[PDB]
Amino acid sequence: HTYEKEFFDLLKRISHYSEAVALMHWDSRTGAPKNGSEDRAESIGQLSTDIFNIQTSDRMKELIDVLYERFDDLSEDTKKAVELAKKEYEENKKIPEAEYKEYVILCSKAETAWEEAKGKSDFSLFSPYLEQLIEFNKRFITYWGYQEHPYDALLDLFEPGVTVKVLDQLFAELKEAIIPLVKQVTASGNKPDTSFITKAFPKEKQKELSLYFLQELGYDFDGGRLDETVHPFATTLNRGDVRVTTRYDEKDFRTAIFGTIHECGHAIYEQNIDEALSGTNLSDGASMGIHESQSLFYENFIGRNKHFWTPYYKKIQEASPVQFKDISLDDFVRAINESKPSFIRVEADELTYPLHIIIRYEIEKAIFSNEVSVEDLPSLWNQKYQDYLGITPQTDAEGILQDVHWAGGDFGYFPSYALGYMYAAQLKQKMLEDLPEFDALLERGEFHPIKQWLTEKVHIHGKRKKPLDIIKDATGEELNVRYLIDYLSNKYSNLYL
Amino acid sequence: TYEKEFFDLLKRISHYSEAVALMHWDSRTGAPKNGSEDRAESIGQLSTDIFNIQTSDRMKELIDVLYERFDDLSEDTKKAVELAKKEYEENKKIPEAEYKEYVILCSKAETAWEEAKGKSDFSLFSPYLEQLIEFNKRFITYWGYQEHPYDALLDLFEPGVTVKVLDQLFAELKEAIIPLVKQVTASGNKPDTSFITKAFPKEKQKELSLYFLQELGYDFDGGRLDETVHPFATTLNRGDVRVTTRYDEKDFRTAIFGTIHECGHAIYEQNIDEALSGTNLSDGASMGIHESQSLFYENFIGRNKHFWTPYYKKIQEASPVQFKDISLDDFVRAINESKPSFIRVEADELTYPLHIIIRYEIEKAIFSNEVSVEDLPSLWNQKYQDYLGITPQTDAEGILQDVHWAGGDFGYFPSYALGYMYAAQLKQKMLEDLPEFDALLERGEFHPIKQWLTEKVHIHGKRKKPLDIIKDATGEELNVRYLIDYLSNKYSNLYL
Ligand SMILES: [Cl-]
Ligand SMILES: [Cl-]
Ligand SMILES: [Cl-]
Ligand SMILES: [Cl-]
Ligand SMILES: [Cl-]
Ligand SMILES: [Cl-]
Ligand SMILES: [Cl-]
Ligand SMILES: [F-]
Ligand SMILES: [Zn+2]
Ligand SMILES: [Zn+2]
Ligand SMILES: [Zn+2]
Ligand SMILES: [Zn+2]
Ligand SMILES: [Zn+2]
Ligand SMILES: [Zn+2]
Ligand SMILES: [Zn+2]
Numbered sequence: 001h002t003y004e005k006e007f008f009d010l011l012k013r014i015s016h017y018s019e020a021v022a023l024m025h026w027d028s029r030t031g032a033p034k035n036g037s038e039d040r041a042e043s044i045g046q047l048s049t050d051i052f053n054i055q056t057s058d059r060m061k062e063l064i065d066v067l068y069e070r071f072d073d074l075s076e077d078t079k080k081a082v083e084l085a086k087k088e089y090e091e092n093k094k095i096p097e098a099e100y101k102e103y104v105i106l107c108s109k110a111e112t113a114w115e116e117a118k119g120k121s122d123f124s125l126f127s128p129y130l131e132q133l134i135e136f137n138k139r140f141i142t143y144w145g146y147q148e149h150p151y152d153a154l155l156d157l158f159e160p161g162v163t164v165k166v167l168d169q170l171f172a173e174l175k176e177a178i179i180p181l182v183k184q185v186t187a188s189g190n191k192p193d194t195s196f197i198t199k200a201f202p203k204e205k206q207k208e209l210s211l212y213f214l215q216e217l218g219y220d221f222d223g224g225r226l227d228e229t230v231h232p233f234a235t236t237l238n239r240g241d242v243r244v245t246t247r248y249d250e251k252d253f254r255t256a257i258f259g260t261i262h263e264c265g266h267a268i269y270e271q272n273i274d275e276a277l278s279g280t281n282l283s284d285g286a287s288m289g290i291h292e293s294q295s296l297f298y299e300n301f302i303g304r305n306k307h308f309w310t311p312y313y314k315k316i317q318e319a320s321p322v323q324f325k326d327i328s329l330d331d332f333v334r335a336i337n338e339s340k341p342s343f344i345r346v347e348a349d350e351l352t353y354p355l356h357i358i359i360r361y362e363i364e365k366a367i368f369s370n371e372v373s374v375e376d377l378p379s380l381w382n383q384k385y386q387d388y389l390g391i392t393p394q395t396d397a398e399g400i401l402q403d404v405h406w407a408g409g410d411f412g413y414f415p416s417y418a419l420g421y422m423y424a425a426q427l428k429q430k431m432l433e434d435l436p437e438f439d440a441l442l443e444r445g446e447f448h449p450i451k452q453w454l455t456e457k458v459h460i461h462g463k464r465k466k467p468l469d470i471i472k473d474a475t476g477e478e479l480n481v482r483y484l485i486d487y488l489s490n491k492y493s494n495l496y497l
Numbered sequence: 498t499y500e501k502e503f504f505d506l507l508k509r510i511s512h513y514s515e516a517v518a519l520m521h522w523d524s525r526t527g528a529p530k531n532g533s534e535d536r537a538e539s540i541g542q543l544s545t546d547i548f549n550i551q552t553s554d555r556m557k558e559l560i561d562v563l564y565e566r567f568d569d570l571s572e573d574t575k576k577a578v579e580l581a582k583k584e585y586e587e588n589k590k591i592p593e594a595e596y597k598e599y600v601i602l603c604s605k606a607e608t609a610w611e612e613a614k615g616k617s618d619f620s621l622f623s624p625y626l627e628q629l630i631e632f633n634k635r636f637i638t639y640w641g642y643q644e645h646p647y648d649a650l651l652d653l654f655e656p657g658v659t660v661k662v663l664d665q666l667f668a669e670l671k672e673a674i675i676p677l678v679k680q681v682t683a684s685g686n687k688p689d690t691s692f693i694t695k696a697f698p699k700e701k702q703k704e705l706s707l708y709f710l711q712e713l714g715y716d717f718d719g720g721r722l723d724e725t726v727h728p729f730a731t732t733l734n735r736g737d738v739r740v741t742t743r744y745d746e747k748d749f750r751t752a753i754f755g756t757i758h759e760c761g762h763a764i765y766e767q768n769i770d771e772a773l774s775g776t777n778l779s780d781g782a783s784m785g786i787h788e789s790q791s792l793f794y795e796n797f798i799g800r801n802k803h804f805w806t807p808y809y810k811k812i813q814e815a816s817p818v819q820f821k822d823i824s825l826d827d828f829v830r831a832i833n834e835s836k837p838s839f840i841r842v843e844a845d846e847l848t849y850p851l852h853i854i855i856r857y858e859i860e861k862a863i864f865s866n867e868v869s870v871e872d873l874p875s876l877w878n879q880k881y882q883d884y885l886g887i888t889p890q891t892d893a894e895g896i897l898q899d900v901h902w903a904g905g906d907f908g909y910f911p912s913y914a915l916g917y918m919y920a921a922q923l924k925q926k927m928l929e930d931l932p933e934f935d936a937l938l939e940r941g942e943f944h945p946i947k948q949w950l951t952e953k954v955h956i957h958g959k960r961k962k963p964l965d966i967i968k969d970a971t972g973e974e975l976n977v978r979y980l981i982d983y984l985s986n987k988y989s990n991l992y993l
Contacts, residue, residue, distance in 0.1 A: 016539040019532075020516045027519055035719040035736030036515075039775070043512035043734075223531035238539075241532025279535075 001070070004078060007063045010054055011081070012279040017051045019238045026243060028112060029229050041108035048104040049097060055085070056092045064089060080464055081281040094143045103136045107409040114407030115230050121397035123378055130406060131374045134367060137411050141368065151368040154412030158288040159419060159467065164365060167415055170481060171358045174418070177485045178354055179388065181492060185339050185351065190496045192334040199323040201253035209253075209319060210246055210260040213312075217298065218451045219244065219264045220271050231404040232259040232346070234266035234295075239278040242270040253320070254336065255347055261303040265295030268451060272459035282463035288413060290458060290467050292420025293427060297454065300350055300421075301428045302447075306333040307439040339492055341389035343398040351492050352389065354484075357418040359384040360403075364411055423471055425484035427457065430475035499566075500574055503559045506550050507577070508775045511734070513547045518733045524608065525725045525741065537604035544600040545593065551581070552588050560585060576960055577777045590639040599632045603905040610903030611726050617893035619874055626902060627870045633907050634864060647864045650908030654784040655915060657964065660861060663911055666977060667854050670914070673981040674850055675884070677988065681835045681847065686992040688830040695819040697749040705749075705815060706742055706756040709808075713760045713794065714947050715740070716767050727900040728755045728842075730762035730791075735774040738766040749816070750832065751843055757799040761791030764947060768955035778959040784909060786963050788916025789923060790954060796846055796917075797924050798946070802829035803938035835988055837885035839894040847988050848885065850917065850980075855880040856899075856910040864907070919967060921980035923953070926971040 024044045032040060054060060067074065067082045074082075092100070110129035117126035141153040149164035156162070211226055229245035236242045244263035249255045269285060277283040285291035302308050309316075313332055317324040324332065339349040345356035363380055366372045372380050381400040386392050393399030405413050431453050432438060441449055457474040471479050520540050528536060550556060563570060563578045570578065588596070606625035613622035633650065642649040645660035652658070707722060725741040732738045740759035745751040765787060773779040781787035798804055805812075809828060813820045820828070835845045841852035859876060862868045868876055877896040878888050889895030901909055927949055928934055937945055953970040967975050 013542065016535070016542045019535060019539045020520060020543060023519060023523055024516065027523065031721055033717070033719050033721055033737045033739075035716070036734045037736070039512070039515060039734035039736065043515045046509065046512045047516060220531075221529070223529050225527055225529060238532045238535040240535060241529045243529075 001074070003063055003066045003070075004074070007067060007078075007082065007085070008280060010060060010063070011085070011281050014051045014054050015238070015279045015283075017047045017054075019241070021047050021051070022235050022237045025108075026235050026237070026245075028108070029115075029231075029233070029245070030227050034112075037109070037112055041105050041112075044108045045101050045105035049101040052092055052097060052100050055088050056097065060085065061089055077277065077280070077282060077464065084281045084463065091144065094145070095140065096143075099136075099139075103140075103409065106132055106136065107407075110409070111404060111407045114401070114404060118397055118401045119230065121395045121401065123396040123399075123401060126401060126407065127374055130377070133406060133409050134374065134411070137409070138368065138370075149365070149369065151365050151412065154364075154368065155415065156412075158413050158416050160287065161468070162289075162415060162419070167361060167418075171361060171418065173481055173485070174354050174358065175388075177489065178351065181489055182339070182341065182351055182355075185492055185496050186341075188496050192338060192495075193331060194335045194338050196323055196327050197254065197335050197338075198251055199320070200250050201320040201323060203248045203250055205319040206248045206250070206253050206256045209315065210256050212315070213257065213261060214244070214264055216312075216445060216447070217261065217264050217268070217302075218447055219267050223271055224267055226260070232263055233404075234263040234270070236270045236284075239270075239273070239275065239283060242267045252347075253316075258299050258303055259346065262295045262299040265298035266291060268298065268454070269294040269459050272451075272455045273462035274460045274464075277462045277464070284463050286458070286461065286463055286465060286470050287467045288416035289419035290423060290470055292417050293423030294420075294454065294458065296417070296421050297424040297427060301424055302442065302450070304337055304350055305439065305442055306337075307442040309333050309336070310443045311445045334495065337491075337495060339495070341391050343385070343391065343393055344402060346403070351488055354418055354421060355388040357414055357421075359388060360414040361418070364414065368411070419479065422479055422481055422484045423467075425487045426471060426475050426477070426480060427454070428487070429483055499559055499562050500570065503556075503563060503581070504574075504577070504776060506553075506556060506559070507581070507777045510547050510550050510777075511775045511779075513543050513550075515733045515737070517543045517547070518731050521604075522731050522733070522739055522741075524604070525611075525727075525729070526723050530608075533608050534605070537601045537608070540604045541597050541601035545597040548588055548593065548596050551584050552593070556581065557585055573773070573776075573778065573960070580777050580959065587640065590641075591636065592639075595632070595635075599636075599905065602628055602632065603903070606905070607900060607903040610897070610900060614726065614893055614897040617891045617897065619892040619897060622897060622903065623870055626873075629902060629905050630863060630870065630907075633905070634866070637864060645861070645865065647861050647908065650860075650864065651911060652908075654909050654912050655963065656783065658785075658911065658915070663857060667850075667857060667914070669977050669981065670850050671854065671884070673985060674847065677985060678835065678837065678847055678851075681988055681992045682837065684992045688834055688991075689827060690831045690834050692819055692823050693750065693831055694747050695816070696746050697816045697819060699744045699746050701815040702744045702746070702749050702752045705811065706744075706752055708811065709753070709757060710740070710760055712808075712941060713757065713798070713943060714764050715760050719767055720763060722756070728759055730759040730766070732766045732780075735766075735769070735771065735779060738763050748843075749812075754795050754799055755842070758791045758795035761794030762787055764794065764950070765790040765955050768947075768951045769958040770956050770960075773958040773960070780959050782954075782957065782959055782961060782966050783963045784912035785915035785919060786954065786966055788913050789919030790916075790950065792913075792917050793920040793923060793950065797920055798938065798943070800833055800846060801935065801938055802833070803935045805829050805832070806939040807941035830991065833987075833991065835991070837887055839881070839887065839889055840898060842899070847984055850914055851884045853910055853914040853917075855884055857914075860907055860910065915975070918975060918977055918980045919963075921983045922967065922971050922976060923950070924983070925979050 021044060024040060028040060064082055064086050067078070068086070071079060106129065110133055113129050114126050117123065137154060141150045144153045146153040152163045155164070214226060215221070223240045224242045224244060227243070227245045229247060232246045234242065234244045244260065244267050246256050246260040246263065269291060273283050309332065310329065313329050337349065339351040341352050342348050345353070348356055363372070363377070363384060366380065367377070378396070378400045382393050431450070434453060435441065435449055438450070441447065458470055461470065465473065468478065517540055520536060520543070524536055560578060560582050563574070564582070567575065602625070606629055609625050610622050613619065637646045637649040640649045648659045651660070651663070710722060711717070719736045720738045720740065723739065723741050725743065728742050730738065730740040740756065740763050742752050742756040742759065765781065769779050805825065805828060809825045833845065835847040837848055838844050841849065844852050859873070859880060862876065874892055874896050881895070882888050927946070931937070931945055931949065934946070937943065954966055957966065961969065964974065
């Protein structure tokens with residue numbers, strides 16, 4: 001089919017602009033000289049609008065139309081690809097190209113601005129951009145339109161189907177189960193010694209471990225690389241180039257470990273999406289939610305599984321000797337999985353983690369129903385952390401400025417971490433049927449069985465299935481919170497109670 | 498509105514260049530080998546994207562409309578359009594589909610080249626060197642030429658330079674160098690060069706390179722230093738000119754002169770009139786003029802023994818065991834040693850030109866179809882014997898030595914000699930306004946020298962042509978005499 005090839009040719013063209021775009025973003029987070037900032041933001045905006053144009057072009061629209069009528073004579077991937085392109089057409093089409101362009105430029109600038117604001121713990125430096133980033137999104141919500149809550153317009157950008165109504169009901173149950181559970185954890189003298197955790201752990205050695213764990217867990221270094229960054233992230237330049245980045249803290253080796261493993265999650269996913277889909281519309285994660293189910297599956301359902309540490313603790317002890325000298329493997333894991341309310345989401349424990357997502361969800365729900373101004377955000381932010389965690393951020397760096405998501409314009413994203421955590425919980429239990437020897441594998445430092453399970457259930461499909469079908473097909477039951485609640489509940493009732 | 502729409506196309510090209518530059522730089526500093534293929538494609542798409550703007554019909558329309566209206570355009574705009582017209586006319590002779598696959602080939606070929614050099618295996622790079630040469634022979638056809646077919650490629654870098662010109666030009670060089678080296682190779686004055694090949698800790702070298710970069714004027718808020726196989730300097734945008742180097746713990750010289758050399762390109766790129774930023778004119782006047790700046794920094798500063806007066810203290814403290822009880826005097830005497838060798842990039846001042854000539858003739862033979870790919874390693878090793886009296890034992894130190902070809906840079910090499918000549922001329926003339934030059938180096942005060950180079954060379958960007966740059970700066974067109982005298986004198990006082 002000629003029209004088909006002209007269609008995929010265009011996507012593959014977009015594919016290349018994407019690599020250039022992702023590299024520029026990655027380069028900006030790994031050393032790009034500040035003097036080049038302005039032109040760098042300009043170029044990212046140009047190549048982004050290029051992609052935008054190829055997707056909003058009359059020709060693209062004609063190719064879609066034609067291919068829809070001949071829908072039956074086409075293969076599965078082609079059908080899904082055109083339906084996907086059709087939505088992206090109708091969707092972008094609602095936005096003035098001149099606006100998308102300056103927005104993209106603003107994001108590139110806002111993020112560099114943000115990186116500085118956070119490093120200095122300066123809200124006022126970021127504030128100006130935050131106001132615009134939002135002002136743009138409010139406007140975009142108008143252009144796309146919505147059915148219930150205007151915030152759904154943004155939620156739909158990451159989890160098609162997830163609405164404010166659906167989330168309220170679900171975050172309700174999480175509160176109902178986590179908060180009281182976290183109170184019990186707080187009301188006990190079972191607090192495990194964690195003194196050895198906050199000691200000095202030489203950076204150079206943490207770097208060795210992160211690289212090591214990556215190799216161990218299955219991250220392909222021939223198709224990736226590890227580098228340092230203020231805020232860890234994983235990006236896909238092209239199917240053969242999926243990079244991850246982490247952050248080291250000599251007073252908490254944990255941050256790098258779980259951050260690296262977290263990112264390793266996304267990477268593994270990306271490094272296993274069917275190669276046939278490469279260069280196309282469907283070579284991407286099913287949704288942030290399903291993507292986060294992979295990062296969280298690795299970080300939490302492996303990295304935070306005590307058997308995962310049996311074989312590796314020997315190394316950790318040798319990397320920073322004086323610190324873990326005479327610390328029991330048993331004490332070590334108990335120290336790692338210490339649950340207690342803290343300020344940083346990225347570094348929070350498994351039990352208190354969901355609350356962070358909830359806090360962000362609600363603040364955003366407010367920002368887009370015009371209930372809060374940029375000026376009162378820090379105050380609103382701090383209040384929520386008190387309501388759900390009983391602690392109040394004292395600095396901007398550990399407060400509102402903590403995450404990069406807003407700086408990049410990613411509003412409506414955060415809830416996907418919650419969902420992702422739920423998906424991970426559900427995938428984990430169902431995986432036990434096929435791999436009962438799970439904990440045994442971790443102790444043997446054997447991860448291909450687990451990885452393979454995920455590749456066939458999630459990875460490989462890429463965007464050939466939607467989240468709903470991904471989970472129903474893998475566990476044979478739609479997304480159900482009970483699993484996460486049971487996992488968490490059962491796990492933190494034994495460590496403390 | 499025409500002039501505006503015109504510069505708007507140029508700025509549009511400028512952002513594609515950053516993207517391309519970055520993709521290139523990234524592929525030389527870490528990019529995963531599995532994204533190798535698609536990386537080539539993206540460079541190709543983005544490169545062809547720039548090509549299409551320069552060859553578009555609307556661009557040609559804007560070109561003509563501004564020419565009619567010429568006399569009313571500004572000096573910058575005039576030159577901007579003259580350049581746009583040259584590239585339009587030049588690129589229009591090449592089939593788009595072909596430039597695209599050619600760009601993709603260079604990207605893939607350079608990747609294959611890094612590996613071939615690493616494994617010292619020519620067979621791995623041969624399949625590519627075959628295609629690169631083919632495309633270009635074919636390009637000579639499209640562009641056309643007058644005297645020698647190689648003239649079409651030489652024109653890509655040094656407009657106005659031809660085989661006739663270079664033959665005569667190099668002829669005088671061989672004549673002055675060859676006998677001069679015999680002498681140096683024939684004297685019991687061989688400076689002691691034992692402490693050089695000692696072990697110099699890589700991590701320490703890196704500190705020095707960063708130190709010298711700061712000293713010589715490189716702006717780190719506008720750039721960065723990173724490692725690579727083959728050092729180079731690139732401009733992503735006016736405020737992002739990066740430089741790379743290569744550390745050898747068994748000869749610190751490689752990283753030092755390598756960095757300072759790249760610093761030259763950078764100090765230049767970082768001083769082109771900002772007004773030309775985002776345009777057609779914000780670049781080097783030509784490869785020769787660029788190599789004139791890198792070579793001025795590398796040789797006329799780095800190799801002027803006075804340069805080491807203020808820094809020799811640091812070199813000793815970085816690797817104390819190595820330079821323990823070695824006189825500053827003996828140091829500079831060893832640094833500027835002159836013995837025939839295999840690697841151009843590391844070759845000494847006296848023998849450097851011979852390396853360029855060897856490549857000049859080889860390339861000349863290549864495009865006049867007087868040699869096949871299969872026979873190049875042979876011919877190459879022969880010339881290295883013909884001019885240096887030594888034969889490469891591995892293709893790594895032989896024909897795989899430099900990257901240029903893998904990158905599709907044929908007709909580029911001569912520009913190093915022209916730059917070296919330009920440097921020699923700029924130098925002697927600079928002595929007129931700066932006699933205390935050697936005094937400045939002893940104090941490590943370079944601002945006087947940089948500012949001179951900036952007013953005479955950098956600031957202009959592409960506003961002036963090389964012929965214009967040199968005439969305006971020295972008062973006379975280019976002249977080999979300055980380089981011959983400089984080398985003649987300098988290396989006669991060392992050994993003879
Ligand atoms: Cl990021
Ligand atoms: Cl981002
Ligand atoms: Cl194994
Ligand atoms: Cl290169
Ligand atoms: Cl002296
Ligand atoms: Cl190159
Ligand atoms: Cl002197
Ligand atoms: F890098
Ligand atoms: Zn994540
Ligand atoms: Zn970002
Ligand atoms: Zn295995
Ligand atoms: Zn150079
Ligand atoms: Zn002297
Ligand atoms: Zn290159
Ligand atoms: Zn002197």
